[PDB]
Design an enzyme around this catalytic site. Structure first.
Site, PDB file in Angstrom:
ATOM      1  N   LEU A  44       0.838  -1.241   0.023  1.00  0.00           N
ATOM      2  CA  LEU A  44      -0.070  -0.069   0.022  1.00  0.00           C
ATOM      3  C   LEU A  44       0.883   1.153   0.019  1.00  0.00           C
ATOM      4  O   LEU A  44       0.366   2.321  -0.658  1.00  0.00           O
ATOM      5  CB  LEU A  44      -0.971   0.053   0.976  1.00  0.00           C
ATOM      6  CG  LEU A  44      -2.106  -0.970   1.142  1.00  0.00           C
ATOM      7  CD1 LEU A  44      -2.839  -1.097   2.459  1.00  0.00           C
ATOM      8  CD2 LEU A  44      -2.992  -0.940   0.029  1.00  0.00           C
ATOM      9  N   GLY A  47       7.463   3.533   4.168  1.00  0.00           N
ATOM     10  CA  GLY A  47       7.434   4.627   5.100  1.00  0.00           C
ATOM     11  C   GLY A  47       9.180   4.634   5.774  1.00  0.00           C
ATOM     12  O   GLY A  47       9.804   3.825   5.646  1.00  0.00           O
ATOM     13  N   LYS A  48       9.156   5.502   6.629  1.00  0.00           N
ATOM     14  CA  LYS A  48      10.331   5.598   7.267  1.00  0.00           C
ATOM     15  C   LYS A  48      10.535   4.769   8.436  1.00  0.00           C
ATOM     16  O   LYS A  48      11.791   4.399   9.119  1.00  0.00           O
ATOM     17  CB  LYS A  48      10.682   7.011   8.134  1.00  0.00           C
ATOM     18  CG  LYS A  48      11.926   7.541   8.355  1.00  0.00           C
ATOM     19  CD  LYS A  48      11.985   8.815   8.886  1.00  0.00           C
ATOM     20  CE  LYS A  48      13.496   9.352   9.354  1.00  0.00           C
ATOM     21  NZ  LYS A  48      13.786   8.264  10.633  1.00  0.00           N
ATOM     22  N   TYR A  49       9.424   4.183   9.216  1.00  0.00           N
ATOM     23  CA  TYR A  49       9.368   3.291  10.148  1.00  0.00           C
ATOM     24  C   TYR A  49       8.939   1.757   9.894  1.00  0.00           C
ATOM     25  O   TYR A  49       9.271   1.006  10.822  1.00  0.00           O
ATOM     26  CB  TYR A  49       8.715   3.912  11.391  1.00  0.00           C
ATOM     27  CG  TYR A  49       9.449   5.194  12.074  1.00  0.00           C
ATOM     28  CD1 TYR A  49      10.997   5.087  12.127  1.00  0.00           C
ATOM     29  CD2 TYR A  49       8.782   6.241  12.476  1.00  0.00           C
ATOM     30  CE1 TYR A  49      11.524   6.142  12.573  1.00  0.00           C
ATOM     31  CE2 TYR A  49       9.498   7.410  12.973  1.00  0.00           C
ATOM     32  CZ  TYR A  49      10.714   7.116  13.177  1.00  0.00           C
ATOM     33  OH  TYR A  49      11.567   8.396  13.721  1.00  0.00           O
ATOM     34  N   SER A  50       8.244   1.884   8.839  1.00  0.00           N
ATOM     35  CA  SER A  50       7.287   0.466   8.323  1.00  0.00           C
ATOM     36  C   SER A  50       7.254   0.532   7.070  1.00  0.00           C
ATOM     37  O   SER A  50       7.215   1.471   6.310  1.00  0.00           O
ATOM     38  CB  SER A  50       6.443   0.339   9.384  1.00  0.00           C
ATOM     39  OG  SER A  50       5.495   1.355   9.052  1.00  0.00           O
ATOM     40  N   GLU A  51       7.090  -0.967   6.547  1.00  0.00           N
ATOM     41  CA  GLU A  51       6.354  -0.865   5.302  1.00  0.00           C
ATOM     42  C   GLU A  51       4.774  -1.424   5.165  1.00  0.00           C
ATOM     43  O   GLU A  51       4.524  -2.399   6.425  1.00  0.00           O
ATOM     44  CB  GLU A  51       7.034  -1.758   4.344  1.00  0.00           C
ATOM     45  CG  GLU A  51       8.569  -1.455   3.928  1.00  0.00           C
ATOM     46  CD  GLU A  51       9.306  -2.360   2.958  1.00  0.00           C
ATOM     47  OE1 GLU A  51       9.074  -3.656   3.512  1.00  0.00           O
ATOM     48  OE2 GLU A  51       9.853  -2.204   2.129  1.00  0.00           O
ATOM     49  N   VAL A  52       3.789  -1.060   4.686  1.00  0.00           N
ATOM     50  CA  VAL A  52       2.580  -1.348   4.717  1.00  0.00           C
ATOM     51  C   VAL A  52       2.074  -1.957   3.467  1.00  0.00           C
ATOM     52  O   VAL A  52       2.018  -1.719   2.338  1.00  0.00           O
ATOM     53  CB  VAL A  52       1.799  -0.190   5.003  1.00  0.00           C
ATOM     54  CG1 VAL A  52       0.261  -0.395   4.931  1.00  0.00           C
ATOM     55  CG2 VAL A  52       1.876   0.737   6.182  1.00  0.00           C
ATOM     56  N   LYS A  67       1.159  -3.961   8.850  1.00  0.00           N
ATOM     57  CA  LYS A  67       2.218  -2.912   9.005  1.00  0.00           C
ATOM     58  C   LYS A  67       3.589  -3.496   9.477  1.00  0.00           C
ATOM     59  O   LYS A  67       3.861  -3.794  10.758  1.00  0.00           O
ATOM     60  CB  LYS A  67       1.983  -2.084   9.991  1.00  0.00           C
ATOM     61  CG  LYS A  67       3.021  -0.762  10.033  1.00  0.00           C
ATOM     62  CD  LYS A  67       2.316   0.328  11.008  1.00  0.00           C
ATOM     63  CE  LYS A  67       3.512   1.212  11.537  1.00  0.00           C
ATOM     64  NZ  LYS A  67       3.014   2.143  12.541  1.00  0.00           N
ATOM     65  N   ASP A 155       1.915  13.273  16.381  1.00  0.00           N
ATOM     66  CA  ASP A 155       2.076  12.998  14.949  1.00  0.00           C
ATOM     67  C   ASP A 155       0.823  13.231  14.091  1.00  0.00           C
ATOM     68  O   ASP A 155       0.457  12.552  13.226  1.00  0.00           O
ATOM     69  CB  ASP A 155       2.706  11.695  14.499  1.00  0.00           C
ATOM     70  CG  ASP A 155       3.453  11.762  12.915  1.00  0.00           C
ATOM     71  OD1 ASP A 155       3.723  12.823  12.675  1.00  0.00           O
ATOM     72  OD2 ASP A 155       3.458  10.648  12.477  1.00  0.00           O
TER      73      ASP A 155
END
Ligand SMILES: O=c1ccc2nc3ccc(O)cc3oc-2c1
Ligand SMILES: [Cl-]
EC number: 2.7.11.1
Length: 331
Positions: A44, A47-52, A67, A155
């Site tokens: 989808l 990201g900087k902290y995870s892949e979705v 996530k 955030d």
């Protein structure tokens, strides 16, 4: 002399009156499921902290969202997990369905209920005045609840607000930076996005509270009604405050510094200078007239304040005349 300490006007001691287990996330134990219960369909977004990824649950053929967390300190993972479990079932709050450990990277991966992958940024261009007030009210529900649950999002941004416009649903996501509020605690200012960072983050005032989320909300409101994304467009963390100072005026700024006795970085003294507090009628033009109202400007002004204690609380915001037409229809 040191900075003047401050406390939250609302929901101040809510965590103190709760058992340890609630807010002490380091001691929280995690029950892990199996990824062989889930199949990844498509990515989808990154990201900087995870892949979705969009994923399917091969037990009930139900679509979910996985996530996959990138390597980050264990307690920060437990924190996001605990916060998700504590806020679970809340108004417009994303629902953590399951916690799973990935077979390949052996990193934890949070599983959420599938929500219509419509971002708030793309819909901005198509929102009517009413739709704005409605969705802003929906966000305020989520914000007031988590604040009441002693949790700051830290955030708040359009990229973190999923909306199913077809059914007019809304979910506040990405609680990876969220933290519990404790009176007296100094927090890390390096949070949120640059364009949505509040003044106390830019001037490094570590004893902030729920009011931080209200500023970010203000930045979103401004961008929507003035049709300018983002409203405060800074190059770095120093220039960001300058962009703000050029609008809210430097007079209130230094008074904010003076009030809390904040040691201001010598760099600011060169780039800040002197600026007047602009009227909101200035940012209004032919393209955004239908979104701007005396009610909107009054509400926006009460969010965008240097003094974080001067900002409206999430509950107060819901009581503003700006949402009168929305509250009515919901009843
Ligand atoms: O339908 C979706 C699509 C993306 C999502 N991204 C998230 C990122 C962090 C989080 O805590 C929850 C999330 O939920 C999502 C649900
Ligand atoms: Cl003016």
């Amino acid at each position: 002399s040191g900075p003047v300490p401050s406390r939250a006007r609302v929901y101040t001691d809510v965590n103190t009156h709760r058992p340890r287990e609630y807010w002490d996330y380091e001691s929280h134990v995690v029950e892990w499921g199996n990824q062989d219960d889930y199949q990844l369909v498509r990515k989808l977004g990154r990201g900087k902290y995870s892949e979705v990824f969009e994923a399917i649950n091969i037990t009930n053929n139900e679509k979910v969202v996985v996530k996959i967390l990138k390597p980050v300190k264990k307690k920060k993972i437990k924190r996001e997990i605990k916060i998700l479990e504590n806020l679970r079932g809340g108004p417009n709050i994303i629902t953590l369905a399951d916690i799973v450990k990935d077979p390949v990277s052996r990193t934890p991966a949070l599983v959420f209920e599938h929500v219509n992958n419509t971002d708030f940024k793309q819909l901005y261009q198509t929102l009517t005045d009413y739709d704005i007030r409605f969705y802003m009210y929906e966000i305020l529900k989520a914000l007031d609840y988590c604040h009441s649950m002693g949790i700051m999002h830290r955030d708040v941004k359009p990229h973190n607000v999923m909306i199913d416009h077809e059914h007019r649903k809304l979910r506040l996501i990405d609680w990876g930076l969220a933290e519990f509020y404790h009176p007296g605690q100094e927090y890390n200012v390096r949070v949120a996005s640059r364009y949505f960072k509040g003044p106390e983050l830019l001037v490094d005032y570590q004893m902030y509270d729920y009011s931080l989320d209200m500023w970010s909300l203000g930045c979103m409101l401004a961008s929507m009604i003035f049709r300018k994304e983002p409203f405060f467009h800074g190059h770095d963390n120093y220039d960001q405050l300058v962009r703000i100072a050029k609008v809210l005026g430097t007079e209130d700024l230094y008074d904010y510094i003076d009030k809390y006795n904040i040691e201001l970085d010598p760099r600011f003294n060169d780039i800040l200078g002197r600026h007047s507090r602009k009227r909101w009628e200035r940012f209004v033009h032919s393209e955004n007239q239908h979104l701007v109202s005396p009610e909107a400007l009054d509400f926006l002004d009460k969010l965008l304040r240097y003094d974080h204690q001067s900002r409206l609380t999430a509950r107060e915001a819901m009581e503003h005349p700006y949402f009168y037409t929305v509250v009515k229809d919901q009843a």
